[PDB]
């Protein structure tokens, strides 16, 4: 909130052959006489500085939230949509793919992966493995350094 | 002034000892950044204002 305003700069007015922007006073610095307080000034304050009471979350009707979850569930049983999203279900026998309850009690990762490869998720687990790439911007060093695909959703 | 108080002469002594270039072994230290004495003073350039 104090950015661009920690200075006592004042306008020089007209008659000095300079623009009427406020200027840092005093002398002997190399900063004295420079423009201040404007969005066009170096080291000034930006136009409409960002506030925290901007709206960050959005409220959606609860019944509309459930509407979209129902359609999302239904769209998971359409093999045309699943392929269109790129989920490598060409060799999958049938969808909805329902497996036995014994998957719910697997404790080790190696056994869990083997069950996934046995039912037809082999080509989709390799899809995520082969899709690891660096991010394409400054988000790399904002704790978002990597990106990859999304595999199956076990329920 | 020739007749001077002790505080002035004591600050004068400290300022005389700071009137020095960098030691030349400082530049060879690992990850050294300092290249010169950026706080050098001269009697003819800048006054102490003490």
């Amino acid at each position: 909130e104090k950015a661009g305003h920690q200075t006592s700069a004042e306008s020089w007015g007209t008659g000095r052959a300079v623009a009427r922007i406020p200027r840092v006073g005093g002398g002997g610095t190399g900063r004295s006489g420079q423009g201040a307080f404007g969005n066009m000034c170096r080291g000034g304050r930006m136009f409409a500085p960002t506030k925290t009471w901007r709206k960050w979350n959005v409220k959606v009707n609860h019944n509309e939230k459930r509407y979209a979850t129902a359609s999302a569930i239904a769209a998971t049983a359409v093999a045309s949509l699943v392929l269109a999203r790129g989920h490598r279900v060409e060799k999958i026998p049938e969808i909805p793919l329902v497996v036995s309850t014994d998957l719910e009690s697997i404790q080790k990762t190696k056994e869990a992966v083997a069950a996934l490869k046995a039912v037809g998720a082999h080509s989709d687990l390799l899809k995520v493995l082969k899709s690891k790439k660096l991010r394409a911007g400054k988000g790399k060093y904002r704790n978002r350094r990597w990106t990859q695909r999304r595999g199956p959703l076990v329920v | 002034a020739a007749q001077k108080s002790f505080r002035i002469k004591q600050k004068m002594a400290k300022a005389k000892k700071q009137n020095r270039p960098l030691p030349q072994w400082i530049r060879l230290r690992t990850n050294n950044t300092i290249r010169y004495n950026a706080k050098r003073r001269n009697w003819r350039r800048t006054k102490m204002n003490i």
Binding site: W53, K55, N57, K59 | -
Partner: protein, 135 residues
């Protein structure tokens, strides 16, 4: 009254702020007594005070003081509450009986502006409360 300490009565403002003489100093005279005594003996704790006499010029009060360093006070749990650091200069902050009279600290509709603190009440109803899911 409290004469406004401006040189030659010049206030340099609007006419409503031109009063100099008949302004009344929201704190009581008894509060001024405990404050001036409380500075004289800073090792003590002001407990209460009462009226003894008055004339045209001065009003006279007696101040009750408690020593928080005396072992007869640090023991005797009925009185050792005054020894807590949260009770430093009760008269300065208006924690004395007359301090809460002037502060308006009381119960009811007649004290709506001052029931829990005037600054606290004003700041609470002059604040913009915004939630994550805007109401």
């Amino acid at each position: 009254n409290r004469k406004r300490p401006v040189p030659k009565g010049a206030t340099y403002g609007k006419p409503t702020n031109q009063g100099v003489n008949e302004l009344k100093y929201q704190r009581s005279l008894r509060a001024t007594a405990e404050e001036r005594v409380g500075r004289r003996a800073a090792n003590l704790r002001v407990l209460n005070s009462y009226w003894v006499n008055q004339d045209s010029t001065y009003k006279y009060f007696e101040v009750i003081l408690v020593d928080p360093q005396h072992k007869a006070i640090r023991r005797d749990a009925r009185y050792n509450w005054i020894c807590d650091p949260v009770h430093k200069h009760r008269e300065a902050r208006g924690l004395t009986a007359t301090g809460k009279k002037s502060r308006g600290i009381n119960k009811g509709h007649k004290f709506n502006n001052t029931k829990a603190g005037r600054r606290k009440t004003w700041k609470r109803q002059n604040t913009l409360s915004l939630w994550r899911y805007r109401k």
